Amino acid sequence: APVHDPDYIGGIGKELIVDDTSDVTSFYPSAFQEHLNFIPAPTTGSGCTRIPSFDMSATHCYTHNVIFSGCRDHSHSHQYLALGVLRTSATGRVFFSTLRSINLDDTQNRKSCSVSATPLGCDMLCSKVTETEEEDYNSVIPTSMVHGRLGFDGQYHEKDLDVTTLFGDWVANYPGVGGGSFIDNRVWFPVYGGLKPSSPSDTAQEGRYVIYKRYNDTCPDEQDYQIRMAKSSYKPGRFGGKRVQQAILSIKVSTSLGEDPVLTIPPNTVTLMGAEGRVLTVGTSHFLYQRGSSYFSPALLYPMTVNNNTATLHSPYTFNAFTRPGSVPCQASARCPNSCVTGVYTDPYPLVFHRNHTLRGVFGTMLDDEQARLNLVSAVFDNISRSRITRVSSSRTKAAYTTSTCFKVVKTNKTYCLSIAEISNTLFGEFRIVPLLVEILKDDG
Amino acid sequence: CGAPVHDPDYIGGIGKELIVDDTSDVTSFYPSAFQEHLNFIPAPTTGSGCTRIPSFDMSATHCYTHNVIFSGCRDHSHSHQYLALGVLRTSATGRVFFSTLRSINLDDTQNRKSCSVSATPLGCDMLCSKVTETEEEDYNSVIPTSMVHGRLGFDGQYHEKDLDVTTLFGDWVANYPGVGGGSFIDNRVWFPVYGGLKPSSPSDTAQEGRYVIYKRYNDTCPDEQDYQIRMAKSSYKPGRFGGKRVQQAILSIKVSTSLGEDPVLTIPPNTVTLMGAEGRVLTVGTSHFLYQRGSSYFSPALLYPMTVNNNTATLHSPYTFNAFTRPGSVPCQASARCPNSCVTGVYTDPYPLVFHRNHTLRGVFGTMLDDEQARLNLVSAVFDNISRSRITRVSSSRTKAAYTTSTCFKVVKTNKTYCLSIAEISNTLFGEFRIVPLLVEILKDDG
Amino acid sequence: DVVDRIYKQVALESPLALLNTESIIMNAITSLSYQIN
Amino acid sequence: DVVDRIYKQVALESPLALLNTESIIMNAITSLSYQIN
Amino acid sequence: CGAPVHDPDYIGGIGKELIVDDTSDVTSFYPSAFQEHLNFIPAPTTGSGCTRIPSFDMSATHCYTHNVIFSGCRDHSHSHQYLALGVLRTSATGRVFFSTLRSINLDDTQNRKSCSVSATPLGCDMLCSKVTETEEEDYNSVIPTSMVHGRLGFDGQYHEKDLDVTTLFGDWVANYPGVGGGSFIDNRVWFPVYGGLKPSSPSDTAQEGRYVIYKRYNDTCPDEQDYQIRMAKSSYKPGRFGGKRVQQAILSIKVSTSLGEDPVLTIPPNTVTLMGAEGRVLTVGTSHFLYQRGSSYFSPALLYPMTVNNNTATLHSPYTFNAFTRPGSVPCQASARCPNSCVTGVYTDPYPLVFHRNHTLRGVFGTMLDDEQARLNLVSAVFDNISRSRITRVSSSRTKAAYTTSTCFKVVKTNKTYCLSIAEISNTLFGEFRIVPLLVEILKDDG
Amino acid sequence: APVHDPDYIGGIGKELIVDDTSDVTSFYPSAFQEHLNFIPAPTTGSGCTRIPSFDMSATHCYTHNVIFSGCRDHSHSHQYLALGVLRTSATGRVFFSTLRSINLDDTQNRKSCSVSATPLGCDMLCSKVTETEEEDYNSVIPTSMVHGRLGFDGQYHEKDLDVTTLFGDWVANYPGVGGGSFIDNRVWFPVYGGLKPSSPSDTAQEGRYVIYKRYNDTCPDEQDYQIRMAKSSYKPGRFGGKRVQQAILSIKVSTSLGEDPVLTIPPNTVTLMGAEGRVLTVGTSHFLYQRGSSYFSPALLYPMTVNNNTATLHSPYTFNAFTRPGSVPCQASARCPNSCVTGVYTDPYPLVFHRNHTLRGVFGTMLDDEQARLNLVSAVFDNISRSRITRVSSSRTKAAYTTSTCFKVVKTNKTYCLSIAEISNTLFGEFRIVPLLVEILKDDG
Amino acid sequence: DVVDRIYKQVALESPLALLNTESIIMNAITSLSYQIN
Amino acid sequence: DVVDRIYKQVALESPLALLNTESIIMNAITSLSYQIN
């Protein structure tokens, strides 16, 4: 029955910075703080740690993947799940210390995974796939899926899910790799995949769409041109014409794992091509982040709502200057809608608030580049602008994921943000997940 | 949470003579390729902080400590120190992994620099040395070197007391731990110590006009007998520090609730020991050994058999392993033949595996940096008087190294033998300065 | 005569018999330490 | 003479004293694991 | 409160072969006068309630139980039962005393009557028998006798389960414990059992046409060989109960968290055992014994050496002590020579003291009621094949007795040997029916 | 840190039966109840247990003496002190179980002793005397004295007291063997002895006196006859003319034993020849019982008061029908005052109360006989009458002491009284201390 | 020769050496059980 | 022949294995008495 040190007590799962009088981008990250690292690194030049997932409530939940044979051979892999708490050191130094940990080494392959912090432990939603995507989209059956939890007891239990009846309309199905959220007794996982052509869940998603545009730029393309693309986007070429729809799954947290699954596929009127993403609850406000894998790069956060066991997404917040770099003409600066799949997962943690409770600004680490996945940088962002920053490295640095969660310490009253990133460097090493710690500061004063 | 005792799978497997055969050929035993287990020794959180100088020891509890420096591994003037207490476990699928059940990081201003851990019934004992200045400077000092005896308990709390060094160490200009693990024997912790002596002190003059000369197997020195006897004498006062005698010592503090209790230094005759250097006091089964780093002219790995009297230990003519070398600068290099004055070389643990029923040592395991001069290309293998086994390379790239520390246990349930070999490696794949707990399975030939 | 040869046990059976009574006692002690509440 | 056989109790008597003091401890450690409230 | 372990003063002193000498004369060892220690076994609160039928056993924990009857020790129909868990201690001045750290009294309606305690790792185990009717009646029964296996733990809580007697005991008309302590061996409690057998049952017919005849030392029976063989046969079906075979048994329940686990009865051949009676299964050092009360024609104290197979035990030709007698009614009296049918005699424990290195039994300690016929004049002494030591009388008055149970330990610190001998005595000084834990120091002659 | 079972909680140290409408002697003892005996019996025909002392507050304190060589040789003896709690059994049966016990076997002789229950343990006041009384009264020095406590820790500590400065006026000094009482942070012990002729404490007690008479009888003796005796009583012949004055000692209960002794010798205007006795606190009311060792047999209880560290006794309650048997003409029925020493210690526990809070009746076991100490019987008594009864034995029975303490169980609401007696019988044995348990009952209904 | 006679230890020193390692281990276990809080 | 002396290690080697497995336990029981919070 673990829980955080008192200094943190009260400042964990709630709204951090509320100012109207403030100027959001006037907040900036401290240079990178030095704490005790909680994320295991590799024991070998063979195995590599990848695809991190993080969530925190009264407990801090973390999981990542260990592939083998130099980050190849999906066929096999382990999975790491840690359950932990935020502590202050004797000198008051912030550090994360995991109180309970389990590494899944069995022959089965959990591939994508996402963790959530629930009162009963760290819940996890993974998929068991022995094959590549491209083949999985030619699959005549939906993807196998598991739900499991690491109890405070330290014992770990997992219930497999019935993917045929639940997912029947889908050719492939995956967790979003992001964080899962505990809302109204349900664990809410980001999910995605693709679904059978001419299926109840398919047709319902045809003739429904949304086209988002950027701040100062406006697309040259005709609407009979544009609309025909944004149309062409939801069933991108790379994967053969099958439609890829975003989704959210909701299970009940109980001593019985895999209880009462309800899958909510929103309308594509409000939502773009399904990608990886996280679900967040800050205070009373819930959101789904979606990877920029489609034509639109800028950071995406959808305010979401609970209707009983179901869910509905509303008009998403847009953040420019926070951009997944992409292939053309989907790249970081793209104004116009097009069909593509490329991009990267970057967590935009909501930060600055109006008393309105709408969202002034968010903080996360992005990849600064037009096309390639390179040069990770941390900062806070505005509907338009970006703050001063802290670069992860001054040398060439390759990235895959950055997932951020921010918390404040009460007793001292200083705000810090954890942004977990998957980096490839000369100093850090090749495939390495680094729990970067940062503090927030007003500019003048 | 969790119980500070190795999973029963290990009961009977930790801390004993592992492989015992007279007839079999030691070097036919050999390491598997590198295994993948769950990793304990933590890496840094930034591109500044760097982990280094590791120390490890294990009994019923596994103790690990490593230093965390900053500003790109510069500015000694500050650092933290990480001490972890842990257990050897087997997974649900039977996989070996080291899980550390208790840890404390020391962030206070004070700098403990060279530090070594030992596994004692009461916790993890540690012997560090608080030094704000440079080794070169320190040897010019008019005072000894502050030294702490700390411990981490199973209650997860840390304590320590500063040894009174003006008496215990009063004859020394500089006093450091061996960075290699300590060992619990006869109700006391026993740590490696080394440093310089105040010229013409009691403990300095006791050591004058004495020395030891060790020669290699198929190789004999051209140098004139008298020549060597002279240069071999000068080996103990390397020109680096001005020629204060740099001597190997061992300190034994009584392990008890009150730290730093009744410390007694052991300063062996240099008719046995070489020029003092880093090292480890270890026990396998019923016998204890001191490892000395190759910092002097002598290339081959050494274990001086150690016997303990009361508060004092005695050292006997050392074991030697000829294919097991440190690299060194000339004419101290890996191929070094004759005696000489120098300070160079690297810390590589020769953990004993194959034993005679004679209870005499046949062969050892360790990761040696294989190269003549620089410290590069770490490789694990089994070593013997003359020869080394088939090897496991750590990588195919240029990868430098600082320390490697090896200890071998056995999971009894499966009756398979393993070796943990911890390396401080610097690499493209792993990272700039990174500590990797390399795991290996020991195998035979022809099966 | 034909006696020594049955003493091979003192260096054979006997020590191994100690290693057992150790291993089991240790297993006992081990489980017991698992009592941390 | 005759001391040959009389010591062969080395494989009879002592291997017991072991087993006996073994069980004494084991029982005493067992009763202990029951003394935790 | 308090820890259920004998003061360290006793470590190495409890439950072993106490005095071992081949050359010395057993009977030259002998009891001191009666010592004064602090008293454990509690006396009654009224002139009605009366304590009786005591049982004792000790390992690392000391277990004692005695029955509390009412209406002047009449009306079996009701009673309580007192089970105490305790430790051997030494005072500040070094005085020996038994302090009982945990006790429970059983006041529920149910009557456990004949009961015996054993010391097991998990607590004090007890085997009682729930009987509302008379022994004479019970032997006329068409059903077995309800039997409980209870235990008191170190958590001071009591539990029990009724053995299923229609199967286990199905061949018996009446089934009782020996009132003498049980013993823990090979991960099981082993209790003495005795009673009648259903005529012509499987276990009855197995015992027909068989018997044992034991004769005394300097004394030989006049009776014709055939005569004896006949009367010796009839000894097993005493006229008291109508001639159902009254047989000695031992039951072993597995000691575990769940009581009454896997019980297995041992019903030895009557070529070894006499007509069944009260008794105790005891272990001293590496060997185990069964005591049988003298209830048949045989006067001298008996210990059948007991060896345990798996769930079954086997009995070998009994030890005998000729100067150690029960009194008995004729022609069963203390001086009894030949075989005969009868039920008489008394329970007196022969606790083994002097041993051969042969590991064979020389002499024993116990309090015998010294008299031919009635049960009177208890006296403690050391006994031997032929002879008894100098004695310690319990009193100079006419004092009757029911049970005496003796076990001998040694305080190792002082290296002095003691014997606890518990007696149910009836006296002017002590009281009507009173249980007195008599303590004695064992001494030598000529020192 | 022990304490009683809840069923007793609330009913321990407080007033038991309050009725004006009632008739006191209409209450009677149940026959003798059967519980689990807490008082150790002898291990031998040599040693004998004698001189019991009992007290209870939140803890139950008991101590007695073990003499040797067939109840002879004062020279040596042990002392037993038990610390315990009142428990209910599973079937609800009342029993006393001592949770902490210590037997003092050392060469020193604590002779008379009295125990009190204090928040810090069981406090005890004994004397160390190696000689008989008759010789102790020829003593040129006061009697050595000890104060000690059995902690809940089980550890026992004892501080000797300075008898010369404290007791200087006394030739001999002893604890009253009764119970000690905890009042206003002081342990209050009954004490007695005799004091040096012509001493500050002596002369003050000359010319001061009290003469008590019985209910229906009035002495024939002249006052110039009587007054001259009651005079002659305080310095009885047996002991050589030395005056024997009752007394009470008060020590502070603290981690430091033997702290701040203050000895209070009351005036003999209010008090008779000093004897053994107990000090009791029931609810808010305090009392000193005094043995009937002098000319006046009937049960004696003095209401006492605390002035800081000092004490003052008031007019004592009288109970007829409760009579220490005595030698002539001091015997059980004696009307007239005379000088004698004979009698017996019998505890009169206060029971029935007026709302006035004065004392209607008391309960204890007495010895029914004119002269000899024989035939112990339990009952409740009135200023005049006595109840129905329960006899301890129908055979010849010798007694020494009876000390009673009464308590109620709340949960069940039944009142029981423990009367500890020192008996000599054929059934019980020779010198035997038996914790007789009794219940109280209304007569009709 | 002159060898047996130095084996008197196996039945002399040896067993007594077991009794010690028992007694001490037991002392250990004993103290430990004194930990009942 | 020669087996005489070679077993006399009965008074050398094994009396150690005892002392060693002794201390192993003692240390393991000691560390345990430190694990109580």
Contact indicator for E62, E18 with CB cutoff of 8 Å: no
Yes or no, beta carbons of F437 and E45 under 8 Å apart: yes
> Coil, strand, or helix at residue B397?
coil
**Which residues in chain H are contacts of C10 at CB distance < 8 A?**
7, 10, 14
Cα angle A348-A351-A355, degrees, rounded to a multiple of 5: 135
Nearest to F127 by CA among F141, F114, F146, F140: F146
Residue type, B430: F
To the nearest whole angstrom, how far is the Cα of B8 from the nearest Cα of chain C? 6
The separation between CA B194 and the C-alpha centre of its own chain, rounded to angstroms, equals 12
> Coil, strand, or helix at residue G22?
helix
Sign for the CA dihedral angle at F224, F227, F232, F233 comes to: positive
Contact indicator for E422, E436 with CB cutoff of 8 Å: yes
D with G: how many residue pairs have Cβ under 8 Å apart? Answer: 34
To the nearest whole angstrom, how far is the Cα of B285 from the nearest Cα of chain C? 12
Contact indicator for E158, E293 with CB cutoff of 8 Å: no
To the nearest whole angstrom, how far is the Cα of H22 from the nearest Cα of chain G? 6
According to DSSP, residue B389 is labeled -
d(CA D20, CA E284): 11
d(CA B352, CA B282): 10
For chain D, the farthest-separated pair of C-alpha atoms sits apart, in whole angstroms, at 59
CA distances from E232 to A302, E210, E227, F187 (A): 101, 9, 8, 73
Sign for the CA dihedral angle at B170, B171, B175, B178 comes to: negative
What does DSSP say about strands F398-409 and E188-197: parallel, antiparallel, or unpaired? unpaired
Residue type, E278: E
The separation between CA B290 and the C-alpha centre of its own chain, rounded to angstroms, equals 9
To the nearest whole angstrom, how far is the Cα of D4 from the nearest Cα of chain C? 7
Nearest to B278 by CA among B207, B183, B212, B346: B346
Q: Chains that contact B by 3+ CB pairs under 8 Å?
A: A, C, H
d(CA E427, CA E434): 8
d(CA E361, CA F284): 68
Q: What would the two tokens of residue F229 be?
A: 């005796």
> Coil, strand, or helix at residue B229?
helix
For chain E, the farthest-separated pair of C-alpha atoms sits apart, in whole angstroms, at 64
Does residue D31 belong to any structural domain of this protein? no
**Which residues in chain E are contacts of F99 at CB distance < 8 A?**
1
Closest residue, chain B, to H20 (C-alpha): B286
d(CA B396, CA B412): 33
Cβ neighbors of B405 (< 8 A, separation 6 or more) are B54, B55, B56, B180, B181, B280, B347, B349, B421, B422
Chain G (6-35) residues lying within 8 Å, Cβ to Cβ, of chain D: 7, 10-11, 14-15, 18-19, 22, 25-26, 29, 32-33
Nearest to E145 by CA among E122, E123, E125, E170: E170
Structure-determination technique: X-ray
Q: What would the two tokens of residue B185 be?
A: 């024997």
> Coil, strand, or helix at residue A276?
coil
Cα angle A75-A81-A85, degrees, rounded to a multiple of 5: 165
d(CA E300, CA E215): 10
For chain A, state the CA radius of gyration.
Answer: 21
Cβ neighbors of E339 (< 8 A, separation 6 or more) are E213, E221, E223, E228, E231, E232, E235, E297
d(CA F209, CA B378): 107
Q: What would the two tokens of residue A337 be?
A: 């809608």
Does residue D32 belong to any structural domain of this protein? no
The separation between CA E399 and the C-alpha centre of its own chain, rounded to angstroms, equals 21
Contact indicator for A39, B29 with CB cutoff of 8 Å: no
Q: Using a CB–CB cutoff of 8 Å, tell me whether B412 touches chain C.
A: yes
Yes or no, beta carbons of D35 and G33 under 8 Å apart: yes
| Domain CATH code at residue F64 | 2.120.10.10
Contact flag for C and D (3+ C-beta pairs < 8 Å): yes
Yes or no, beta carbons of C32 and H28 under 8 Å apart: no
Contact indicator for A148, A84 with CB cutoff of 8 Å: no
Q: What is the resolution of this structure in A?
A: 3.3
User: Which among F37, F46, F426 is the nearest to E432, CB-wise?
Assistant: F426
Yes or no, beta carbons of C24 and D25 under 8 Å apart: no
To the nearest whole angstrom, how far is the Cα of D36 from the nearest Cα of chain C? 8
Closest residue, chain B, to A392 (C-alpha): B47
d(CA E442, CA E420): 11
How many domains does chain E divide into?
1
**Which residues in chain D are contacts of G28 at CB distance < 8 A?**
none
To the nearest whole angstrom, how far is the Cα of H26 from the nearest Cα of chain G? 6
d(CA A267, CA F430): 99
Q: What would the two tokens of residue B97 be?
A: 């992994």
**Which residues in chain H are contacts of B5 at CB distance < 8 A?**
28
d(CA A80, CA F285): 72
The CB density around residue F394, as the number of other CB atoms within 10 Å, is 8
**Which residues in chain D are contacts of E255 at CB distance < 8 A?**
none
For E294: left if phi > 0, alpha if psi spans -120 to 50, otherwise beta; the answer is alpha
Yes or no, beta carbons of E45 and F36 under 8 Å apart: yes
d(CA F68, CA F70): 6
Nearest to E116 by CA among E108, E107, E128: E128
Contact flag for H and C (3+ C-beta pairs < 8 Å): yes
Yes or no, beta carbons of F36 and E439 under 8 Å apart: no
Yes or no, beta carbons of E155 and D17 under 8 Å apart: no
Q: Is the peptide bond before F303 cis (omega within 30 degrees of 0)?
A: no
> Coil, strand, or helix at residue A136?
helix
Burial F276-293 (b: 16+ CB within 10 A, else e): bbbbbbbeebbbbbbbbb
Residue A223 has φ and ψ, to the nearest 5°, of -75, -40
> Coil, strand, or helix at residue B151?
strand
The CB density around residue F345, as the number of other CB atoms within 10 Å, is 25
Nearest to B189 by CA among B156, B135, B152, B144: B152
**Which residues in chain B are contacts of C31 at CB distance < 8 A?**
8
Residue B350 has φ and ψ, to the nearest 5°, of -90, 80
Contact indicator for B175, B193 with CB cutoff of 8 Å: yes
The CB density around residue A301, as the number of other CB atoms within 10 Å, is 22
**Which residues in chain G are contacts of E11 at CB distance < 8 A?**
23, 26-27, 30
Mapping DSSP onto H, E and C, the string for chain E reads CCCCCCCHHHCCCCCCCCEECCCCCHHHCEECCCECCCCCCCCCCCCCCEEEEEEEEECCCEEEEEEEEECCCECCCCCEEEEEEEEEEECCCCCEEEEEEEEEEECCCCCECCCEEEEECCEEEEEEEECCCCHHHHCCCCCCCCEEEEEECCCCCEEEEEECCCCCCCCEEEEEECECCCEEECCEEEEEEEEEECCCCHHHHCCCCCCCCCCCCCCCCCCCHHHHHHHHHHCCCCHHHCCCCEEEEEEEEECCCCCCEEEEEECCCCCCCCECCCEEEEEECCEEEEEECCCCCCCEEEEEEEEECCCCEEECCCEEEEEEECCCCCCCCCCCCCCCCCCCCCEECCEECEECCCCCECCEEEEEECCCCCCECEEEEEECCCCECCCEECCCCCCEEEEEEEEEEEECCCCEEEEEEEEEEEECCCEEEEEEEEEEEEECCCC
Nearest to A406 by CA among A373, A443, A437: A437
d(CA B417, CA B411): 7
Contact indicator for F191, F180 with CB cutoff of 8 Å: no
Residue F68, judged by CB atoms within 10 A of its CB (0-12, 13-18, 19+), counts as middle
Closest residue, chain H, to G33 (C-alpha): H33
To the nearest whole angstrom, how far is the Cα of D3 from the nearest Cα of chain C? 10
Cβ neighbors of F259 (< 8 A, separation 6 or more) are F251, F252
Nearest to A7 by CA among A94, A75, A79: A94
Q: Using a CB–CB cutoff of 8 Å, tell me whether E243 touches chain D.
A: no
Nearest to E401 by CA among E385, E387, E384, E421: E421
Contact flag for B and D (3+ C-beta pairs < 8 Å): no
Range(s) of the domain holding residue F159: 1-445
Dihedral angle, C-alpha A252, A255, A256, A257, nearest 10 °: 70
Residue type, A410: V
Mapping DSSP onto H, E and C, the string for chain F reads CCCCCHHHCCCCCCCCEECCCCCHHHEEECCCECCCCCCCCCCCCCCEEEEEEEEECCCEEEEEEEEECCCECCCCCEEEEEEEEEEECCCCCEEEEEEEEEEECCCCCEEEEEEEEECCEEEEEEEECCCCHHHHCCCCCCCEEEEEEECCCCCEEEEEECHHHHHCCEEEEEECECCEEEECCEEEEEEEEEECCCCHHHHCCCCCCCCCCCCCCCCCCCHHHHHHHHHHHCCCHHHCCCECECEEEEEECCCCCCEEEEEECCCCCCCCECCCECEEEECCEEEEECCCCCCCCEEEEEEEEEECCEEEECCCEEEEEEECCCCCCCCCCCCCCCCCCCCCEECCEEEEECCCCCEEEEEEEEECCCCCCECEEEEEEECCCECCCEECCCCCCEEEEEEEEEEEECCCCEEEEEEEEEEEECCCEEEEEEEEEEEEEECCC
The number of C-alpha atoms within 13 Å of F359 and in the hemisphere containing its C-beta is: 27
Q: Which of E1, E5, E286, E359 to mutate to test the interface with G (most CBs of G within 10 A)?
A: E5
To the nearest whole angstrom, how far is the Cα of D27 from the nearest Cα of chain C? 10
Burial B318-357 (b: 16+ CB within 10 A, else e): bbbbbbbbbbbeeebbbebbbbbbbbbbbbbbbbbbbbee
Q: Chains that contact F by 3+ CB pairs under 8 Å?
A: E
Residue type, F243: R
Contact indicator for B26, B18 with CB cutoff of 8 Å: no
Q: Using a CB–CB cutoff of 8 Å, tell me whether E92 touches chain F.
A: yes
Yes or no, beta carbons of F45 and E107 under 8 Å apart: no
Q: Chains that contact D by 3+ CB pairs under 8 Å?
A: C, E, G
d(CA A65, CA A44): 15
**Which residues in chain C are contacts of D10 at CB distance < 8 A?**
7, 9-10, 14
User: Which among A42, A97, A393 is the nearest to B39, CB-wise?
Assistant: A42
Closest residue, chain E, to F155 (C-alpha): E92
Yes or no, beta carbons of C25 and D26 under 8 Å apart: yes
Q: Using a CB–CB cutoff of 8 Å, tell me whether E443 touches chain G.
A: no
Contact indicator for B397, B412 with CB cutoff of 8 Å: no
Nearest to B406 by CA among B57, B130, B128, B110: B57
d(CA H4, CA G7): 10
CA distance between the termini of chain E = 42
User: Which among E3, E4, E11 is the nearest to G26, CB-wise?
Assistant: E11
Q: What would the two tokens of residue B333 be?
A: 């290099």
Yes or no, beta carbons of G10 and H15 under 8 Å apart: no
Yes or no, beta carbons of G29 and D24 under 8 Å apart: no
Contact indicator for F206, F268 with CB cutoff of 8 Å: no
**Which residues in chain A are contacts of B110 at CB distance < 8 A?**
none
Q: Looking up tokens 């003496």, which residue turns up? A: F65
**Which residues in chain B are contacts of H30 at CB distance < 8 A?**
121-122
Yes or no, beta carbons of B5 and C36 under 8 Å apart: no
Contact indicator for E366, E378 with CB cutoff of 8 Å: no
Yes or no, beta carbons of D24 and G22 under 8 Å apart: yes
| Strands of the E364-369 sheet, one edge to the other | E351-352, E364-369, E378-383, E392-393
Q: Looking up tokens 């030049």, which residue turns up? A: A45
> Coil, strand, or helix at residue D22?
helix
Yes or no, beta carbons of G7 and H10 under 8 Å apart: yes
Q: Give the residues across from B117 on adjacent strands.
A: B126
Yes or no, beta carbons of E60 and D27 under 8 Å apart: yes
E with F: how many residue pairs have Cβ under 8 Å apart? Answer: 113
